[PDB]
Swiss-Prot record:
Protein name, as recorded: Major prion protein
Keyword Glycoprotein appears in the UniProt entry: yes
One GO cellular component, as annotated: dendrite
Domains as described in the record: The normal, monomeric form has a mainly alpha-helical structure. The disease-associated, protease-resistant form forms amyloid fibrils containing a cross-beta spine, formed by a steric zipper of superposed beta-strands. Disease mutations may favor intermolecular contacts via short beta strands, and may thereby trigger oligomerization.
Length: 103
């Protein structure tokens, strides 16, 4: 749970076309190191994905930096920015089992 949320047991690595070839490659080359689990606050009612993705691209990104750097990993500012796109996806990629209606 992590308290307020559902840290789902695992989810898929997304694939995302960044609009630049090397930003696609940057993420893809890194998708192994990147999260395999994210928090989600469920869009039961609120609606637009960005509104709930707030607590994700906040607290998931924190919990995949702080808690990964703890073992001696380190994701750069760029690694983190790349992860934003993946975390907005993953949070939905999880609850998509309803929210394919929304996304």
């Amino acid at each position: 749970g992590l308290g307020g949320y559902m840290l789902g047991s695992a989810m898929s690595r997304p694939m995302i076309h960044f609009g630049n070839d090397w930003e696609d490659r940057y993420y893809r080359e890194n998708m192994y190191r990147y999260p395999n689990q994210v928090y989600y606050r469920p869009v039961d009612q609120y609606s637009n994905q960005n509104n709930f993705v707030h607590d994700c691209v906040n607290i998931t990104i924190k919990q995949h930096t702080v808690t990964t750097t703890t073992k001696g990993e380190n994701f750069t500012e760029t690694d983190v920015k790349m992860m934003e796109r993946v975390v907005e996806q993953m949070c939905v990629t999880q609850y998509q089992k309803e929210s394919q209606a929304y996304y």
